[PDB]
């Protein structure tokens, strides 16, 4: 059998439109690589089937609302039609009595001449893949970007910018809320422990992808301050001077709480009205979780190996292991 998304040949891979596919847990991810002819056919069959005089169907389209206007899927009459057509085709393919494949719960991204970015969510990420050839100027690859490598040439052929999905952010927020409530009985240490757990989950799961999402940053600051106020409220104090970061971020060994800052971060707050249209370079830094007598509390994000690094690294070390295993075999020893 094939390895994950390998093919016995190139020809076989190229034969069909449906170049890749994966059903992560009741959420399919069909990748189609159409030609102009095929696309034309699809649009034809669909459009003829389901006509519309104007563009019209551009509204009621499931775009990626987290990304910015010129970043997410542009609304070309053609490409959009293709997308919708594709979705229709897929719906036709599965019987309705078996399951509900409603357009409303379906994001269709498109890559083309007129659409340079290629979007999706998976495992609660949002991933904007953008190939190097289509980028106007390849800047210093930022953080929260995966440079993807072509297997043949071994060059960084494409980038994949990463946001955290709104859904995941919401889930996180809910978690924080849960922690907060049912804590009148609960003691400060326990509260902080729970919060610590929550934060480490949130990062260690999607590490690198936190850089991008400003809403997540906001939640982290807001949430963290709420937690702090749980302690500060608990002492009926709730006051800045008398809870210097000693009490919170110092560990449980030293009478502290062990709270793990994902807070004293400077929140990148770019021009909100422009940022909606296009991605900006971060220009203005807002002060997130501030304090009087500001001792620069280190974050947690710096002390977790960001995923891309972890994965390249993984590839290296596993390769090394493989090589040494061969050595062991040759030498006839226990490695």
């Amino acid at each position: 059998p094939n390895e994950f998304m390998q093919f016995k040949s190139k020809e076989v891979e190229k034969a069909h439109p449906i170049r890749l596919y994966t059903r992560y847990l009741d959420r399919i991810y069909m990748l189609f690589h159409f030609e102009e002819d095929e696309g034309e056919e699809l649009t034809d069959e669909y459009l003829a089937e389901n006509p519309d005089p104007n563009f019209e169907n551009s509204i009621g389209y499931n775009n990626r609302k987290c990304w910015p206007k010129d970043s997410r899927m542009r609304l070309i009459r053609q490409d959009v039609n293709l997308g919708r057509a594709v979705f229709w085709e897929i719906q036709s393919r599965v019987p309705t009595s078996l399951t509900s494949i409603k357009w409303e719960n379906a994001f269709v991204s498109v890559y083309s001449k007129n659409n340079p970015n290629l979007l999706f969510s998976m495992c609660g990420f949002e991933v904007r893949i953008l190939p190097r050839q289509r980028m106007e100027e390849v800047v210093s690859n930022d953080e929260g970007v995966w440079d993807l490598v072509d297997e043949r040439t071994k060059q960084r052929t494409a980038k994949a910018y990463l946001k955290v999905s709104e859904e995941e952010i919401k889930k996180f927020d809910s978690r924080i809320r849960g922690i907060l409530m049912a804590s009148g009985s609960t003691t400060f240490t326990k509260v902080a422990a729970k919060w610590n757990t929550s934060l480490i989950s949130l990062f260690t799961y999607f590490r690198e992808a936190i850089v991008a999402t400003e809403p997540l940053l906001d939640i982290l600051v807001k949430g963290e301050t709420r937690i702090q106020n749980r302690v500060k409220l608990g002492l009926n104090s709730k006051m800045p001077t008398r809870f210097p970061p000693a009490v919170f971020y110092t560990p449980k060994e030293l009478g502290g709480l062990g709270m793990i800052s994902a807070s004293h971060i400077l929140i990148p707050a770019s021009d909100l009205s422009w940022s909606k249209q296009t991605d900006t370079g971060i220009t203005h830094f807002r002060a997130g979780m501030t304090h009087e007598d500001e001792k620069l509390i280190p974050t947690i994000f710096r002390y977790i190996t960001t995923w891309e690094n972890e994965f390249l690294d993984s590839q290296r070390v596993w390769a090394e292991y493989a090589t040494k295993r061969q050595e062991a075999i040759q030498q006839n020893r226990r490695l």
Partner: peptide
């Protein structure tokens, strides 16, 4: 050619039975 090879190639006044209601439940359960 490729689209042939599939298996399938080509108001109510009840608050518990409103389209809005069922939809809402679907949304807020998982």
């Amino acid at each position: 050619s490729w689209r042939k090879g599939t298996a399938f190639g080509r108001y109510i006044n009840d608050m518990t039975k409103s389209e809005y209601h069922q939809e809402f439940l679907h949304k807020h359960v998982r």
